[PDB]
Amino acid sequence: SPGIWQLDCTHLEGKVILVAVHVASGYIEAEVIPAETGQETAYFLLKLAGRWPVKTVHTDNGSNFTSTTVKAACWWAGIKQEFGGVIESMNKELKKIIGQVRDQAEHLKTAVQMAVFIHNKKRKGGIGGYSAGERIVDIIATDIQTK
Amino acid sequence: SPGIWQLDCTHLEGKVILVAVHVASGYIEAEVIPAETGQETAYFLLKLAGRWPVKTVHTDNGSNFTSTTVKAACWWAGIKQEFGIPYNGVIESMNKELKKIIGQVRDQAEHLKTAVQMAVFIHNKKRKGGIGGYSAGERIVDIIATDIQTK
Amino acid sequence: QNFRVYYRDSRDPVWKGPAKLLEKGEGAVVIQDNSDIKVVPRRKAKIIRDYGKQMAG
Amino acid sequence: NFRVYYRDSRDPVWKGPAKLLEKGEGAVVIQDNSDIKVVPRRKAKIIRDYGKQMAGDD
Ligand SMILES: Cc1nc2c(c(C)c(C)n2Cc2cnn(C)c2)c(-c2ccc(Cl)cc2)c1[C@H](OC(C)(C)C)C(=O)O
Ligand SMILES: Cc1nc2c(c(C)c(C)n2Cc2cnn(C)c2)c(-c2ccc(Cl)cc2)c1[C@H](OC(C)(C)C)C(=O)O
Numbered sequence: 001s002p003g004i005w006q007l008d009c010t011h012l013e014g015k016v017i018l019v020a021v022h023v024a025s026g027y028i029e030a031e032v033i034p035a036e037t038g039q040e041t042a043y044f045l046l047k048l049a050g051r052w053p054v055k056t057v058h059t060d061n062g063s064n065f066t067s068t069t070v071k072a073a074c075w076w077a078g079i080k081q082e083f084g085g086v087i088e089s090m091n092k093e094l095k096k097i098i099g100q101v102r103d104q105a106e107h108l109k110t111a112v113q114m115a116v117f118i119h120n121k122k123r124k125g126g127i128g129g130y131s132a133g134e135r136i137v138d139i140i141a142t143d144i145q146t147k
Numbered sequence: 148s149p150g151i152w153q154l155d156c157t158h159l160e161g162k163v164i165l166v167a168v169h170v171a172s173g174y175i176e177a178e179v180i181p182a183e184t185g186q187e188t189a190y191f192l193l194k195l196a197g198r199w200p201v202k203t204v205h206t207d208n209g210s211n212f213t214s215t216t217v218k219a220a221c222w223w224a225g226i227k228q229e230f231g232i233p234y235n236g237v238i239e240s241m242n243k244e245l246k247k248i249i250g251q252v253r254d255q256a257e258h259l260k261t262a263v264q265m266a267v268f269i270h271n272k273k274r275k276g277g278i279g280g281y282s283a284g285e286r287i288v289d290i291i292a293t294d295i296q297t298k
Numbered sequence: 299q300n301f302r303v304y305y306r307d308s309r310d311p312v313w314k315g316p317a318k319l320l321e322k323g324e325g326a327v328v329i330q331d332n333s334d335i336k337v338v339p340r341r342k343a344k345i346i347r348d349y350g351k352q353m354a355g
Numbered sequence: 356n357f358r359v360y361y362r363d364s365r366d367p368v369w370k371g372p373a374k375l376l377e378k379g380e381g382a383v384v385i386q387d388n389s390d391i392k393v394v395p396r397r398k399a400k401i402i403r404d405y406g407k408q409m410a411g412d413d
């Protein structure tokens with residue numbers, strides 16, 4: 001549960017955005033990639049797995065996610081792949097924020113990182129509200145203590 | 148204190164590696180950037196600030212770190228910049244171990260940027276002292292988690 | 299204050315800033331950099347808000 | 356502990372993951388879907404779970 005991620009590709013302004021969502025927290029990481037290829041997807045995964053404890057990734061049957069480069073990265077990093085709606089709901093919120101801040105950036109990739117920033121740090125409103133960035137840190141912290 | 152980061156640029160095989168180290172934990176984030184410019188540094192910073200609480204960045208007076216693009220990114224993300232005093236290294240301690248791991252796994256990757264991300268992986272998961280110790284990735288999570296509980 | 303402007307003067311390619319915003323017109327931006335009023339085309343002006351700071355804490 | 360990816364002769368599509376059987380001086384013996392092949396060391400990318408060994412969790 002602490003290491004379950006959903007990955008998918010979305011498209012804006014002719015560019016390819018690779019999105020990773022931590023399922024249990026809603027925390028997201030996203031970046032424009034130069035092409036929707038397995039080579040770029042694998043490099044994305046190696047970065048992600050070196051920063052968060054990635055144990056399982058859920059993707060569709062896209063060619064980039066079934067590539068030999070991605071399967072090798074998952075073998076090297078110890079990631080289990082699963083090709084069987086949190087990402088769609090969270091990505092709809094990412095597209096919402098990208099449109100909010102689009103005029104603040106020249107390049108789309110800059111707006112994407114601005115939107116990722118806002119998404120992960122925006123606290124929930126009421127009593128005891130926390131952000132997605134705070135939720136994933138808490139989830140990983142408690143899993144480490146229960147060694 | 149939990150949001151203190153040190154950033155510096157290092158070079159390998161003719162390429163520019165931008166390194167960010169979380170001071171309180173030794174957790175590092177590194178990536179090959181196409182040029183040692185403020186434009187690439189600023190994009191690196193916005194990515195980092197969206198992932199971790201980055202409140203203060205310690206850098207030297209390199210042109211990329213003193214650039215207008217970097218200062219604009221810190222103003223947008225609310226990051227305080229702390230440039231070093233000219234004429235004079237905690238990042239060097241972790242950067243020395245970074246180059247050591249890059250050389251250990253360099254043959255495992257065709258591109259240097261892949262070897263760099265492999266080294267970041269191993270550095271952040273390596274338990275300090277031994278199997279009975281903790282890693283940099285666990286230390287930064289513990290530091291941030293307990294800091295969240297304060298407020 | 300929440301706005302900081304970066305701009306280019308003349309054909310000097312290096313960007314100057316931060317300057318204070320006064321009005322973002324259609325094809326021109328009015329700024330003041332250290333008691334010096336300047337009128338810069340919208341193309342040569344980049345306005346940066348502390349938007350991420352206002353959405354974090 | 357070891358997986359190998361390879362290309363057959365004059366075939367640009369990479370094959371794998373193949374199960375490594377033995378490693379020679381400049382060649383490896385691997386098994387891809389119950390088919391055993393001998394691929395040169397030049398056209399072979401050998402990937403071990405090096406990162407998985409430094410990460411103890413499942
Ligand atoms: C393309 C770009 N050029 C910029 C700036 C700024 C402030 C200046 C003056 N310039 C001109 C320039 C180019 N080199 N130098 C030395 C000066 C920014 C920017 C916009 C918003 C934030 Cl918070 C931070 C930076 C960007 C952004 O791209 C990244 C990848 C982020 C750099 C973008 O997409 O708008
Ligand atoms: C350049 C490269 N090509 C690779 C692989 C693999 C396994 C194959 C078969 N190929 C040929 C290929 C290229 N596209 N496709 C569709 C097949 C890897 C690799 C090496 C180690 C790990 Cl753990 C993971 C991937 C890389 C690495 O680069 C990244 C950026 C990581 C992809 C690198 O730098 O070695």
Ligand SMILES: [Mg+2]
Nearest residue numbers: 008009060062
């Ligand atoms: Mg898809």
Ligand SMILES: [Mg+2]
Nearest residue numbers: 155156207209
């Ligand atoms: Mg330096």
